[PDB]
């Protein structure tokens, strides 16, 4: 259990729909940009909550999964376990290299499993992150490929880019959000 | 509670931004930010310790200056913001016009001795699109 930073990693296609030459704004479970990823070396239970990101550099140690550089996104949504996959030919020993890799869907399994628990199956290194219901602006090229993305929760600039649906913003003052102060306690009389 | 506006000089100039928390006491919003008490938290955001209370709300990231210029991005009351050297985002009370001292005298008149033909323009939106909708 060590620590790594996810440098724009964990982006995937939200659906089976072709869109092109466009910025698509959507809320879904995504690995937040620069979230903390736990590093592992070698079989502990690593809790699964609201979607899990998994990756490994192996060597071929991770040869199975239990739910009850090769990288994947596993999410439990509306009765299905969705699995996304992708792979970078980069030789790294103990860290996720900084990088972006849009993942493509592999499975959509109708499994009535309350997945709260996750464990990797290790034969004879890997990383785990968590997804959050953040909003992203996904940049689609002319062939329906997501080549880039903006995490709308990262900073006020990113938020403004999402609000105006652009990577280029003109001059001015724009309302992008609304804030609320949250309670420090509970008074019952 | 209140709105949040993001103030930008335009990305063609700079991607640098300032944030206005509207209709709030600056002391309180600053505390909530440091106390992790705001709902729309920005994960890598930092105030930069340049917080200015204006009638419109708490303006964070703009420097306050004692100079004045023509209004560019209005904030509220007499405060406007723009991109200036001290470039950075600055807030200031806007200028109303040039400072002109006109003499008054009961025996003196100024009379133009030359002129300039000038051509200016006006633009007017005479028409809009003729849309049509099939209700059913």
């Amino acid at each position: 259990y060590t620590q790594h930073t996810s440098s724009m990693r964990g982006v995937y296609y939200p659906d089976e729909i072709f869109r092109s030459d466009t910025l698509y704004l959507t809320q879904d479970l995504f690995l937040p940009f620069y979230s903390n990823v736990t590093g592992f070396h070698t079989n502990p239970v690593i809790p699964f909550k609201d979607g899990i990101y998994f990756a490994a550099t192996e060597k071929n140690v991770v040869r199975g999964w239990v739910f009850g550089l090769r990288e994947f996104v596993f999410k439990n949504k509306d009765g299905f376990l969705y699995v996304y996959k992708g792979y970078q030919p980069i030789d790294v020993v103990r860290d996720l290299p900084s990088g972006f890799n849009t993942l493509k869907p592999i499975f959509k399994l109708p499994l009535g499993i309350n997945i709260t628990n996750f464990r990797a199956i290790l034969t004879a290194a890997y990383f785990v992150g968590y997804l959050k219901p953040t909003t992203f602006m996904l940049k689609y090229d002319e062939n329906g490929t997501i080549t880039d993305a903006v995490d709308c929760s990262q900073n006020p600039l990113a938020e403004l880019k999402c609000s105006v649906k652009s990577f280029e913003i003109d001059k001015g003052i724009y309302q992008t959000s609304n804030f609320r102060v949250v309670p420090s306690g509970d008074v019952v009389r | 509670f209140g709105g949040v506006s993001v103030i930008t000089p335009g990305t063609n100039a700079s991607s640098e931004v300032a944030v206005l928390y509207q209709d709030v006491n600056c002391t309180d919003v600053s505390t909530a930010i440091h106390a992790d008490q705001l709902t729309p938290a920005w994960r890598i955001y930092s105030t930069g310790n340049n917080v200015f209370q204006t009638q419109a709300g708490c303006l964070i990231g703009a420097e306050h200056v004692d100079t004045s210029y023509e209004c560019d991005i209005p904030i509220g009351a007499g405060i406007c913001a723009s991109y200036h050297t001290v470039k950075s985002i600055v807030a200031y009370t806007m200028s109303l016009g040039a400072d002109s001292s006109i003499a008054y005298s009961n025996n003196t008149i100024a009379i133009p001795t030359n002129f300039s033909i000038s051509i200016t323009t006006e633009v007017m939106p005479v028409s809009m699109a003729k849309t049509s909708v099939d209700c059913n």
Partner: antibody
Amino acid sequence: VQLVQSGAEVKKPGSSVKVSCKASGGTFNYHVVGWVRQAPGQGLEWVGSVSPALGRTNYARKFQGRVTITADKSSNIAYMELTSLRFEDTAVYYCARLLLVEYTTSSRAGGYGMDVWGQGTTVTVS
Amino acid sequence: LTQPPSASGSPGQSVTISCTGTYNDIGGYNFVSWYQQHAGKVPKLMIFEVSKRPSGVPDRFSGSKSGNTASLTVSGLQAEDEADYYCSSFAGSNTFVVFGGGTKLTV
């Protein structure tokens, strides 16, 4: 790997020059090739880049309508064509390999720094 | 991207150079590199990632990033370090790379 540049070039005040860079003792592979306009006595600025693996490019806004950056992975040589070259464009014109590697349009890894630099192609324009 | 025009200190001194960004460039992305350039020389990469040093660089060179500010530290400054230092960063995909001006360090 050592990037090798052309050099000692002198050009007219309204001209077109193509600067070449070869990857010697290795290949460009997936690395992005960047170009930097450092002017004599001045700091340095980005001109643009090409990624030989994809054929994709990037330009600094100043050169968007002035400089064409290309590469041909089969000769393993990168090129920069500076058109409408002006007096103000005198520079050492360094080329360099970026650490960033692009595998496909949606997959890339590594940082944006540059490890392997050529010796520079000084282009003097009168 | 903004850098001071100069930096200095005694040999053996810890001397730093700062760079300021935005929510792109330095800040927004963890891709801030530094270069050492002696007059007449090709810039040498000194820092690859915000804190990660490339091979071929002595361990007196290190750095970090806080907020939107990057910092280069040369601990145990040598005469051989009289060079300009430049920082650059991933500017986002439209600009791709942005550089500040050089900071000349004097020993």
